[PDB]
Subunit: 36 residues, 3 copies
């Protein structure tokens, strides 16, 4: 359980970093529409 | 504390899954505007 | 390690709350375009 929890937390942190980049990518496309 | 930490990690993982789906839903609406 | 894990989990939870607010902010701008 302890080692499984360490790995689950690292996976959740990784997923948050990937979601922040996806949000930046969608913001870029939104801004092109807003200022087009 | 240990059992509280397990539950807090599961809640954070759940929230990440719900945020990924919300991002997909916003991407779908953005793509309809971008290709309309 | 245990105390470092507690702090890493709190940081991940904080990041999720900030990403939810960023998603709401992008949704607001998207909705203005969709209903403009
Ligand atoms: Pb987390
Ligand atoms: Zn703008
Ligand atoms: Zn597109
Ligand atoms: Zn709408």
């Amino acid at each position: 359980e302890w080692e499984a929890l360490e790995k689950k937390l690292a996976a959740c942190e990784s997923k948050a970093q990937a979601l922040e980049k996806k949000l930046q990518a969608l913001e870029k496309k939104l801004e092109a529409l807003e200022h087009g």
